[PDB]
Design a protein around this ligand. Structure first.
Ligand code: CLA
Ligand code: CLA
Ligand code: CLA
Ligand code: CLA
Ligand code: CLA
Ligand code: CLA
Ligand code: CLA
Ligand code: CLA
Ligand SMILES: CC(=CC=C/C(C)=C/C=C/C=C(C)/C=C/C=C(C)/C=C/C1=C(C)CCCC1(C)C)/C=C/C1=C(C)CCCC1(C)C
Ligand SMILES: CC(=CC=C/C(C)=C/C=C/C=C(C)\C=C\C=C(C)\C=C\C1=C(C)CCCC1(C)C)/C=C/C1=C(C)CCCC1(C)C
Ligand code: SF4
Ligand code: SF4
Ligand code: SF4
Lengths: 65, 132, 81, 154, 31, 75, 733, 76, 42
């Protein structure tokens, strides 16, 4: 806590169910390393019975900001 | 379920989302489970993995048929009575063409109510009381 | 394609996730870093029929497979007999 | 007046309808109720469709051939409230069905776990957001298009 | 039993004489 | 009529009325009026449940009418 | 386990029967199946439909060839009184001796079935008459329809180029066509009607010998080139005519004068020809509009490009719509389909109230099984139109190459598009259906009054600003005079477009509350039909449930269970689903004409009036009234008038019904008992060893959505086929 | 044997040659059905049967008529 | 016992005491004016 970790993020890929909608996050990755970090989470479910997916900062367009 | 099982509440389960297999109706909202709930409402692969009860339900929720067949028939004996035509028809069979039901002349209704025998307006019958 | 339906996802972890599907899917082939580190989308698929039991469970987050293979043996439908 | 014929003040074809047809209603020379106290063709059912004489009100009402009455409503000669009068009425009633649709709804998505409060109903009909509709003077006709549901939220 | 290339022969022949004269007739006895 | 409504329940896909139910769900969200209680299409076999049952209560009372109307009155 | 079918490969060694069916229905899918190149393909559709035109002339030939030796003509051109023309001689060994009973029809000998196609009033209506004078038909058309094949080959043979790149121009072609083709195709027709036909009509013959010696006039093409045209149109025809024999003939081609006649309705002799002429400048003036090398005119981009009317300063592009309608070939075959689709009905809805033939309506049958084979089709198109513009989006199309660009945005801003479509239907739904049950709850209930019944105001309206000089009525500026036209009068709208009410054949039939419903229920059809086609199309690409729905887009019918449960969600199966409403509009609409017409002939019209404002009645009198004739035609008392028809009509009810299997069956149940039913043979003597070469299976999981359909359809379309005929023929009307 | 049976008729009565239908009279059957078991039911009150005027079900082959004085009821 | 800012709940189909009734009072206006098809005003 000091910058911004997981406090409000849209999705922008167009495949991902809650795509353009902004729900909440969690333990976003630490290290330099990989390509699929970030958990996100929101109320609304989706086509599977369980939906709580991990997208990745190449993107999260949050966008402003 | 899980709720209070115990021993430790007469306090009935009115309030707390769900019941019916176990990542159940989930917190997370949906509609499918509202046709679920009515469908398969009676079933047995859930309620408990253990006979026991089920025959203890089916011998009860049976019952409410007889009772029903019984609230039914009443409104048919009453009906086949004071909404008469049975008195009228019997001194006068070969002749009559029986009724038990009749409208009330609200809106369009009445056309449905058309001279049936011992001198009155109503809708006929093909359900052979008046004959038991 | 001749069995080409994509169930991929991103975790490709397979614990309380997905196993079901007659022979086809001998995976756990850990790619150099993907969390519970077992990945991809299949093994040698020239063996069995056309399920989507394939997802039904454990994410594909996109599509999920089904029939799309066309070129379709018989061993690839129960009935060659 | 317009394409069909004139109202009730005269409508020959219409007259014949009054008359045969209903009155055959009659049709039952007797059929017994000389004094008897049920079988009510007799009183009204006719007379309630009938004492509807050379009066029905008077309504204008155009009446074509066979003299069943047609509805113009083009706002002229007489016929205006065969759509608008009962038209704005349809509008006003609905819209205060869904003004409150967009209400015992936009009042929830908050506080603590609000995930189906709706299969039960918090205030029945809303009975709180209730009159918001008659308590629409102007309302969405401004505050819908400016602010709240504001293009922002668009 | 000289079957050594045939059948095309018996499907013009046989079947042009189960149908040539078979349909035609000199004085109807009509449909 | 009801019968000739069954076929629609009997004869059709399923991610169809989904694919449709969203266009709907979209227009819904703009005014802010839908999401809560994830509206969903019919449960493949529910769909068949609302075939059949209709096809019968349709195709049947049809004659229940057809009949009582040719024994009342001559016959 | 061998190798066979010569184009595909996955299909080719598939051991089942799919091997077969799926062979006979991938044939025509050139773009992408083994044998193909953008060079192959094109040409492989080119000498294909040169295999077209080709088959259209072996049709037309024989049309003119079961006619010339029998099938009355040196009759029906003696005076065509509504008694049973002729197509061809029915000849089936199954026929009883009631070969003798009508079926065997008057003039000719052995039994026959009469022209319900129009041909018989246009092989006649352009003159073409005498039974010694006539027996050409095939002779030409066929010494034509073979050439039709010759290019086929010639242009298939490499060498004398079959042409490859040259297939993506436009400008050149269509700079060619809508001149070369249409224009001169008109003109040249303008040619024919006029030298050889108009004379054959009002006037007299033309003898196969002379063609110079015959001269519509005494002193030739007179001025004409002398800009002086006008004095064609003076004493052109007359009316005390006796059609075909002069006498009250007169001879001055062209007009707009005179009009209707109890002796023939039908557009005047001339007018269908100044017109054919008149348009033939515009297209020729049109042709010559684009490049073709010399260096005038236009490049078919650079007037799209940044053309754009409301674009300009509204942040909404227009990039190479050309190299995407051109590089598409599907965009192509579906801007093709429609236009044709929209005009196939404009043809066939104008072909009545304005039939252009010598005795037609006042025939009233051929006139009613001819509006519809042009209503079926036409509907049948439209769908296919809408269906090759949901294939463009998958096989072709190219998001990186089209974007900000107005074909996109169309995709992009799509969720609304189906909704503000669906909102039309749902409204157009229950609101038609309030009005029609209500209208049927009120009758039955005893109260014919109370009946809800809106006049079709904005309808009749269009027509009291035309000619519907029905029982007066001013209208503010019009009155029925003071101002009339002022700027128009005795030119143009003479006797024509002046049919008025004409209870017989007035063109415009006098519209009331019966028509303010069907007319809203043909409107609830193409709307609903298209929310599904629009939708069908507006994502053969994918969506939420199936996001990546592609590389095959079209017919991938089915998917696995789970996700929500996924099904007929290929843009084909929405096409598949579409075709039911194109088969329900194109029925409300056709249904409507006829009831109307029927009644508007050998009798009333009040009939459709208070008895189409409701629903039951649409079934009772029409449907139930007016079948009579046909069905008591197999009758327990011998085969009477019609028998083909009623047996067709039950053939109609079976082919239909038997759709359903296919439709409520779904490969699973079928395959499995064939698993048990192919344990027979193998396990039974006098039927062992005996090998199939194709492995017994149950139909593909798209295939049967088709076949029930392609089954649902004939039944259905073969039932009205035999229904209307089998009752517009009897009549009474 | 159980439906196209009917379809014969159409195809051949619409063809029309009754000679050869399946009529209760064209294909060989001749103005009687009778000799089976119906005719040994209404007639059985003369076995081990005691009796009692009529049968068991008036709708059987043998004897009797007189059934009702408004409309009808059952007969053979 | 109910003051300000929403209240107490209610069942699955209290709509069956809302179709039946309310709506039901409306036949009750469709016999007071036993008829429609336009309407006088107040
Ligand atoms: C799917 C089906 C199909 C079928 C089976 C038919 C069948 C028919 N149509 Mg038809 N039609 C269709 C689709 C179809 N149509 C479509 C999609 C349209 C809309 C475009 C039409 C629009 C249409 C019209 C407007 C008419 C018909 C008519 C007819 C009937 C006339 C017979 C005929 O067509 O010979 C066809 C004849 C030919 C193919 C040869 C003539 C072609 C000429 C124009 C060639 C000119 C080339 C010339 C050599 C160039 C000269 C150059 C040089 C000499 C200067 C026949 C019932 C006619 C009718 O009303 O009958 C009562 C007429 O009214 N149709
Ligand atoms: C006028 C023309 C037009 C043209 C030039 C084409 C051309 C093409 N269409 Mg097409 N199409 C059209 C109109 C047209 N279509 C219309 C109007 C529709 C619906 C209204 C369609 C619906 C359609 C579909 C679904 C598909 C095509 C496809 C294609 C491509 C392959 C053709 C094929 O599969 O046939 C091969 C078919 C056969 C050899 C015969 C089997 C066809 C069956 C269904 C018979 C149909 C009914 C029949 C007359 C009833 C039996 C007769 C009875 C008397 C016994 C090819 C690009 C395919 C494609 O490539 O898309 C990706 C395919 O998906 N079309
Ligand atoms: C006669 C038929 C039956 C009915 C009533 C419908 C009705 C409908 N179809 Mg449909 N359909 C049918 C047969 C039917 N279909 C068949 C056989 C097929 C092919 C197999 C299809 C294929 C099809 C497609 C592809 C589509 C439709 C769509 C629609 C909807 C279009 C919107 C509309 O028309 O207004 C709305 C509806 C009506 C006027 C029908 C009455 C509905 C209300 C009034 C019910 C009455 C309430 C009643 C008092 C309460 C009783 C319920 C209970 C409490 C007792 C509509 C619901 C489309 C759609 O989804 O639109 C958005 C589109 O998807 N249909
Ligand atoms: C009118 C109907 C159509 C027809 C012809 C059939 C026929 C059949 N159905 Mg079926 N079905 C239908 C509609 C139809 N169905 C529909 C609409 C549904 C659901 C909506 C179903 C649901 C269904 C189920 C679940 C089952 C069947 C089964 C069957 C088979 C039963 C055995 C039998 O008697 O077949 C043969 C006899 C006929 C089909 C009738 C006679 C046909 C006539 C016209 C003779 C033609 C033969 C002649 C040589 C023609 C050649 C001439 C040449 C020009 C081609 C049979 C193939 C069952 C089965 O396979 O069990 C054996 C199975 O249980 N059906
Ligand atoms: C003839 C029919 C009938 C009968 C006798 C029953 C009987 C029963 N149903 Mg039931 N049900 C029926 C038709 C019937 N149902 C129908 C048509 C549906 C629609 C799907 C349901 C949906 C349904 C559900 C979801 C549930 C039941 C349940 C029950 C049982 C609960 C008794 C109770 O809790 O207090 C009795 C309460 C009263 C008498 C209070 C007055 C309420 C009004 C309606 C009178 C009982 C055995 C419950 C169960 O699982 O038990 C087996 C369960 O919750 N039913
Ligand atoms: C089996 C049936 C059931 C059904 C379908 C009906 C149906 C009817 N009853 Mg009924 N009734 C029933 C059981 C039923 N009753 C029983 C068990 C009783 C005993 C309480 C009654 C006592 C009763 C009375 C006193 C009346 C009705 C009346 C009616 C008619 C109006 C009833 C109504 O609810 O709104 C309306 C309607 C035909 C009304 C009637 O007789 O005249 C139309 C009259 O109100 N019923
Ligand atoms: C979808 C719409 C449609 C519309 C616009 C109407 C409109 C009307 N119906 Mg109606 N009706 C409909 C569908 C419709 N109906 C259907 C589908 C049915 C069959 C279930 C009926 C069965 C029906 C009956 C039996 C009656 C009506 C009556 C009426 C009138 C009474 C309204 C009233 O009392 O206002 C008064 C209050 C205000 C205007 C406020 C009104 C003109 C009543 C009438 O008197 O005849 C016209 C009569 O009761 N309707
Ligand atoms: C549907 C409509 C639209 C269309 C396509 C037309 C088309 C036409 N109008 Mg027209 N018109 C229209 C609306 C339309 N009008 C309206 C709204 C008015 C009222 C002001 C007129 C008043 C009008 C007059 C006075 C005349 C035309 C005439 C004409 C024709 C020739 C014009 C010309 O010479 O160049 C042409 C067919 C002329 C004509 O040829 O009619 C005989 C001339 O008479 N129009
Ligand atoms: C001119 C007109 C018109 C119109 C109208 C119109 C003008 C219409 C149109 C139509 C069209 C259409 C209807 C089309 C459709 C199609 C489509 C839409 C397509 C789509 C697609 C898809 C699906 C995807 C992609 C591809 C494609 C594109 C194919 C008219 C005019 C007029 C009038 C009337 C009035 C009077 C005057 C006049 C002058 C006489
Ligand atoms: C349109 C409608 C209706 C229709 C309807 C139809 C059009 C049909 C229906 C039908 C139903 C039914 C049908 C049910 C039932 C029933 C019953 C009761 C039955 C019985 C029986 C039995 C017992 C068994 C079998 C046989 C029978 C069937 C007889 C309505 C509409 C509407 C509107 C406008 C809006 C609001 C709502 C409403 C008001 C609603
Ligand atoms: S998504 Fe499916 S099978 Fe794919 S990686 Fe996970 S569980 Fe493995
Ligand atoms: S999904 Fe496919 S690969 Fe997987 S098991 Fe099923 S058939 Fe086999
Ligand atoms: S059809 Fe059946 S199986 Fe096939 S996809 Fe649909 S559901 Fe699945």
């Amino acid at each position: 806590i000091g910058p911004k970790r997981g406090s409000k993020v849209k999705i922008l890929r167009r495949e991902s169910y809650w795509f353009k909608n902004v729900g909440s996050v969690v333990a976003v990755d630490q290290d330099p390393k990989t390509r699929y970090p970030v958990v996100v989470r929101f109320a609304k479910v989706n086509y599977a019975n369980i939906s709580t997916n991990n997208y990745a900062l190449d993107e999260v367009e949050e966008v402003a900001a | 379920l899980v709720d209070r099982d115990p021993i430790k509440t007469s306090f009935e389960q009115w309030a707390k989302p769900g019941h019916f297999s176990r990542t159940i109706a989930k917190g997370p909202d949906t509609t499918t489970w509202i046709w679920n709930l009515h469908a398969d409402a009676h079933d047995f692969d859930s309620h408990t993995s253990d006979l026991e009860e089920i025959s203890r339900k089916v011998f009860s929720a049976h019952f409410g048929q007889l009772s029903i067949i019984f609230l039914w028939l009443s409104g048919m004996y009453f009906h086949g009575a004071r909404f008469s035509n049975y008195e009228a028809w019997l001194n006068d069979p070969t002749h009559i063409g029986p009724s038990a039901q009749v409208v009330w002349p609200i809106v369009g209704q009445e056309i449905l109510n058309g001279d049936v025998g011992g001198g009155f307006r109503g809708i006929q019958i093909t359900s052979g009381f008046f004959q038991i | 394609m001749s069995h080409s339906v994509k169930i991929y996802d991103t975790c490709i972890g397979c614990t309380q996730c997905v196993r079901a599907c007659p022979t086809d899917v001998l995976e756990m082939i850990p790619w150099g870093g993907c969390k519970a580190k077992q990945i991809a989308s299949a093994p040698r698929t020239e063996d069995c029929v056309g399920c989507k039991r394939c997802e039904s469970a454990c994410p594909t987050d996109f599509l999920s497979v089904r029939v799309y293979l066309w070129h379709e043996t018989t061993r690839s439908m129960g009935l060659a007999y | 007046d317009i394409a069909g014929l004139t109202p009730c003040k005269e409508s020959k074809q219409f007259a014949k309808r009054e008359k045969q047809a209903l009155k055959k209603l009659q049709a039952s020379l007797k059929l017994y109720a000389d004094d008897s106290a049920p079988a009510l063709a007799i009183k009204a059912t006719m007379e309630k469709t009938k004492k509807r004489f050379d009066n029905y009100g008077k309504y204008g009402l155009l009446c074509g051939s066979d003299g069943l009455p047609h509805l113009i409503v083009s706002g002229d000669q007489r016929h205006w409230g065969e759509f608008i009068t009962p038209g704005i009425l349809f509008l006003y009633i609905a819209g205060w069905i869904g003004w409150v649709g967009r209400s015992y709804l936009i009042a929830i998505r908050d506080e603590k776990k609000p995930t189906q409060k709706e299969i039960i109903i918090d205030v029945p009909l809303a009975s709180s957001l209730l009159f918001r509709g008659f308590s629409w003077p102007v309302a969405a006709y401004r505050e819908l298009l400016n602010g709240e549901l504001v293009d922002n939220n668009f | 039993t000289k079957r050594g290339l045939l059948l095309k022969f018996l499907i013009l022949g046989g079947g042009s004489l189960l149908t040539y004269v078979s349909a035609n007739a000199p004085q109807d006895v009509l449909p | 009529f009801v019968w000739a409504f069954s076929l629609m329940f009997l004869f059709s896909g399923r991610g169809y009325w989904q694919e449709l139910i969203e266009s709907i769900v979209w227009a819904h969200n703009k005014l802010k009026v839908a999401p809560a209680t994830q509206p969903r299409a019919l449960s493949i076999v529910q769909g068949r449940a609302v075939g059949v049952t209709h096809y019968l209560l349709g195709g049947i009372a049809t004659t229940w009418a057809f009949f009582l109307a040719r024994i009342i009155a001559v016959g | 386990a061998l190798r066979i079918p010569r184009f595909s490969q996955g299909i080719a060694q598939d051991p089942t029967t799919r091997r077969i069916w799926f062979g006979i229905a991938t044939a025509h899918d050139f773009e992408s199946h083994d044998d193909i190149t953008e060079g192959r393909l094109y040409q492989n559709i080119f000498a294909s439909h040169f295999g077209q035109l080709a088959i259209i002339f072996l049709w037309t030939s024989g049309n003119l060839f079961h006619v010339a030796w029998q099938g009355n003509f040196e009759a029906w051109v003696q005076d065509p009184f509504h008694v049973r023309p002729i197509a061809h001689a029915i000849w089936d060994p199954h026929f009883g001796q009631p070969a003798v009973e009508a079926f065997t029809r008057g003039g000719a000998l052995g039994p026959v079935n009469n022209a319900y196609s129009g041909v018989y009033q246009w092989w006649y209506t352009i003159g073409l008459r005498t039974n010694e004078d006539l027996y050409t038909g095939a002779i030409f058309l066929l010494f034509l329809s073979f050439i039709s094949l010759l290019a086929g080959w010639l242009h298939l043979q490499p060498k004398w180029k079959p042409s490859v790149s040259w297939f993506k121009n436009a400008e050149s072609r269509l700079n060619h066509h809508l001149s070369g083709l249409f224009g001169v195709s008109s003109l040249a027709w303008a040619g024919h009607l006029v030298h050889v036909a108009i004379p054959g009509s009002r006037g007299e013959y033309v003898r196969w010998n002379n063609f110079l010696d015959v001269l519509p006039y005494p002193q030739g093409l007179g001025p004409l080139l002398t800009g002086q045209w006008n004095l064609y149109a003076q004493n052109p025809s007359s009316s005390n005519h006796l059609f075909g024999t002069t006498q009250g003939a007169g001879t001055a081609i062209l007009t707009i004068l005179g009009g209707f006649h109890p002796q023939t309705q039908s557009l005047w002799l001339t007018d269908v020809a100044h017109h054919h002429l008149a348009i033939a400048f515009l297209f020729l003036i049109g042709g010559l509009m684009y490049r073709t090398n010399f260096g005038i005119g236009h490049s078919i981009k650079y007037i799209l490009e940044a053309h754009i009317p409301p674009g300009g300063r509204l942040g909404r592009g227009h990039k190479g719509l050309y190299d995407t309608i051109n590089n598409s070939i599907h965009f192509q075959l579906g801007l093709a389909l429609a236009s044709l689709g929209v005009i196939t009905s404009l043809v066939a809805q104008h072909m009545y109230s304005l039939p252009a033939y010598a005795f037609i309506a006042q025939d009233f049958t051929t006139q009613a099984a001819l509006y519809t084979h042009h209503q079926y089709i036409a509907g049948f198109i439209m769908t296919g139109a809408f269906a090759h513009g949901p294939i463009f989006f998958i096989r072709d199309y190219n998001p990186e190459q089209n974007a900000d660009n107005v074909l996109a945005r169309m995709l992009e801003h799509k969720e609304a598009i189906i909704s503000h479509l669906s909102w039309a239907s749902l409204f157009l739904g229950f609101h038609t259906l309030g009005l029609y049950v209500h209208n049927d709850v009120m009758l039955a209930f005893g109260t014919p009054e109370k009946q809800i019944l809106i006049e079709p105001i904005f309808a009749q309206w269009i027509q009291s600003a035309h000619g519907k000089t029905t029982y007066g009525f001013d209208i503010p500026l019009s009155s029925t005079n003071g101002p009339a036209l002022n700027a128009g009068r005795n030119i143009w709208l003479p006797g024509w477009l002046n049919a008025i009410n004409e209870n017989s054949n007035s063109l415009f039939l006098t519209i009331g509350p019966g028509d303010f419903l069907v007319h809203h229920a043909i409107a609830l059809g193409l709307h609903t039909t298209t929310l599904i086609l629009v939708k069908g199309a507006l994502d053969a690409r994918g969506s939420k449930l199936m996001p990546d729905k592609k590389d095959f887009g079209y017919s991938f019918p089915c998917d696995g269970p789970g996700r929500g449960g996924t099904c007929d969600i290929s843009a084909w199966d929405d096409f598949y689903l579409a075709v039911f409403w194109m088969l329900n509009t194109i029925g409300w609409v056709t249904f409507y004409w006829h009831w109307k017409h029927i009644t508007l002939w050998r009798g009333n019209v009040s009939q459709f009036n208070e008895s189409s404002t409701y629903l039951m009645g649409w079934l009772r009198d029409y449907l139930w009234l007016n079948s009579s004739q046909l069905i008591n035609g197999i009758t327990p008392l011998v085969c009477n008038s019609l028998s083909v028809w009623a047996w067709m009509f039950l053939f109609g009810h079976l082919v239909w019904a038997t759709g359903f299997m296919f439709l409520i069956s779904w490969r699973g149940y079928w395959q499995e008992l064939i698993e048990t039913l192919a344990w027979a043979h193998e396990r039974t003597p006098l039927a062992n060893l005996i090998r199939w070469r194709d492995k017994p299976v149950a139909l593909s999981i798209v295939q049967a959505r088709l076949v029930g359909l392609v089954h649902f359809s004939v039944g259905y379309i073969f039932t009205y086929a035999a229904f209307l005929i089998a009752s517009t023929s009897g009549k009474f009307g | 044997h159980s439906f196209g049976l009917y379809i014969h008729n159409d195809t051949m009565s619409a063809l029309g040659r009754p000679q050869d239908m399946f009529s209760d009279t064209a294909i060989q059957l001749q103005p009687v059905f009778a000799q089976w078991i119906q005719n040994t039911h209404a007639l059985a009150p003369g076995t081990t049967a005691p009796g009692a005027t009529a049968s068991t079900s008036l709708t059987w082959g043998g004897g009797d008529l007189v059934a009702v004085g408004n409309k009808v009821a059952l007969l053979p | 016992m109910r003051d300000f800012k929403t209240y107490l709940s209610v069942a699955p189909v209290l709509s069956t005491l809302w179709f039946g009734s309310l709506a039901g009072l409306l036949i009750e206006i469709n016999r007071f004016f036993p008829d429609a098809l336009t309407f006088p005003f107040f």
